[model samples]
Target: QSWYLLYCKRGQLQRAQEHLERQAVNCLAPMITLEKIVRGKRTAVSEPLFPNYLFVEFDPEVIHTTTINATRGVSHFVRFGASPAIVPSAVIHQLSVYKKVIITEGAFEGFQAIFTEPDGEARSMLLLNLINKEIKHSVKN
Candidate 1:
């Protein structure tokens, strides 16, 4: 039920998916359909969520490692070891949740300008989420 990264030929998501499906592998290739104005000619293209990458479902252990490296236009799965990395389920879920809330409510809100408080004064003016000094997300009202 998790996605495994697969290398695809540049701009060849559809072909990759079709081939994988023929081999009984499940794939997820989220794309956005769009019209383009390349060279002043109108055309359509489907762009992937992550460029030059696609996801497939497979047993990292059972699947022969060589098949991946041997397949033309395909490469080994993204890995942290000899086996494929397990996609942390919560991460992409949280990203989707936060993205929904952030885009709808806080879209385009730039870094907050924070000022230091005097002694004995209480204020929340530090954005822990950002690395830079005086980062805005932590600024208090």
Candidate 2:
């Protein structure tokens, strides 16, 4: 089975991946760890690296078209002209070994915010929030 690109429903990549995998489809959806604060307490969370893209390894001839579309959270396969775009095995290999964090239990949780530059402190970070407001946050060890 060759790897093909799938365009999943927005904000549903994880769900689609899990659903497809249950059907015996080999799915890949790369993700990253980020620091976020919920109710004033900071925590580490996983988020999709790609907004709406997923990958699957399968023989199209063996999988029914209806089955793919009927799967929960799936939208459709990404195509170039009429063919599903093939993801290179080398690219997949590179992403598979990448770690999104260094430690899972630190104040920083071994991960950093998605976008920001060093604030010139040993552990201070400049973060922009969802409301376009910016603030300096000192991360813990």
Candidate 3:
């Protein structure tokens, strides 16, 4: 099976991923969750890692282009010249590891937190529970 990149409509990444999966298509759409106090309101938001694009895996001999293109929420395969672009397995492996990993040794070790990019050079950051309030703690790499 080869991995192919699919360019989806803006704001439809989640929709496209779910639709393709329901049809038994292997889809990988990476995302990051964000939380912030916006105007004194605690809000949690999720955003796609690669905007408007997702990865799909299938055998050329098994699944054809016509079937993929007909899937809902898909715009088209990301192509170069006449063929759909192929994603490197190494890249996929890296992403998969990030998704599967857990906090091994930390205050939030047992809790599942979405992996997110660090702020500046700080490796990891967490909101610690001190008494009854939240305190931001920055963990260096």
Candidate 4:
């Protein structure tokens, strides 16, 4: 019932979950799909909430035998000294909240998108598909 961080093998982070599931280890990967203008074409992608980071739910000590160390894409947990870092409850709560909302409202809707990820800076863009209030007032006739 606790969250733990996993060091993913580069792009293999997503695939790691399958490995965990095979071992019957519960997991959670927080993600957001956003519509972005990649090359003048509006596209959407579900990316990790925190790039290069995703979470898994389990107690390492309990799963010591089925530990993720054997998983192909997982490196290790975020450890402070001897033990791995524990994921905060708020972070998981927010993700749970998003799961309930995103299905209908869609991801990143009603907010603003700024900044470019392909580059090294933030690019501004529309977070939500515009439902312009002004459009309603326009007379077609």
Q: How many clashes (backbone N, Cα, C below 3 Å) per candidate? A: 2, 0, 0, 8
Model 3, 17-131: lDDT tens per residue?
A: 8877886778876655667566789787665544566778877678777787777777887543345444333333343345412222332331233244422112112211210
lDDT values, one for every candidate: 0.44, 0.50, 0.52, 0.49
lDDT of 2: 0.50
Candidate 4: residue pairs that collide? 113-125, 114-123, 114-124, 115-122, 115-123, 115-124, 116-122, 116-123
TM, every model: 0.47, 0.50, 0.53, 0.55
* TM-score for candidate 1, residues paired by index: 0.47
Ranking by lDDT: 3, 2, 4, 1
Off by over 4 Å in 4: 80-83, 94-96, 99-141
Taking the tens digit of each residue's C-alpha lDDT, what string does model 4 give over 9-114?
Answer: 7778768878888876776665556776779988886665445454667665777524676787887665432453534333323424444343223223322232
**Lowest-scoring 10 consecutive residues by lDDT in candidate 2?**
127-136
Top-down TM-score ranking: 4, 3, 2, 1
Which lDDT value does model 2 have at 10? 63
Worst 10 residues of 4 by lDDT: 127-136
Local error of candidate 1 at 6, Å? Answer: 1.3
TM-score of 3: 0.53
Cα lDDT for residue 53, model 2?
Answer: 61
Sum up the clashes in candidate 4.
8
List the candidate 3 regions with Cα displacement exceeding 4 Å: 34-45, 80-82, 99-141
Q: Is candidate 1 or candidate 4 better by TM-score?
A: 4
